[PDB]
Amino acid sequence: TSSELAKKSKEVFRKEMSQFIVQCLNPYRKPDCKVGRITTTEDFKHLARKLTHGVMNKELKYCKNPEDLECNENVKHKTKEYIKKYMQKFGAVYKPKEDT
């Protein structure tokens, strides 16, 4: 049932994860963020979207069956760790035009 299960699971996942990523990015949008400080809300939102999309794509590659495409613990783990490591490339400020 995973073709349709996943229709709903990807949107739910991407939503959960966008919220989780949003939560994760929250300290970065703060004016005293040392690393990967998010410039603007639009950038914050764009990045949250983008990160959701990259976690999603990478696991869709290494999972292939979206019955497991969930913003689960494993995924969260991978995500927030990915996020940190990701934002470390921006430097002080988040500069997506100089992103990977």
Here the tokens at position 9 are 């699971």
For the record, the structure tokens of 79 come out as 């995500």
Helix axes 41-63, 2-25, angle to 10 degrees: 140
Q: State the DSSP H helix or E strand holding residue 84, giving kind and residue range, or none if neither.
A: helix 73-87
- Give the determination technique: NMR
Q: How far is CA 44 from the centre of its chain?
A: 11
Q: Which two tokens stand for residue 42?
A: 């639009």
Give the helix, strand, coil percentages of the chain, each rounded to 5.
70, 0, 30
Q: Which domain holds residue 26?
A: 1-100
What DSSP string runs through 39-66? --HHHHHHHHHHHHHHHHHHHHHHH--G
Of 35, 23, 15, the closest CA to residue 93 belongs to: 35
On whether the CB atoms of residues 56 and 13 are closer than 8 A, the answer is yes
The answer to whether the CB of 49 falls within 8 A of the CB of 68 is no
Cα separation, 53 vs 33, whole angstroms:
24
Element spanning 23, H or E: helix 2-25
CATH number at residue 61: 1.10.1740.100
Q: How many domains does the chain have?
A: 1
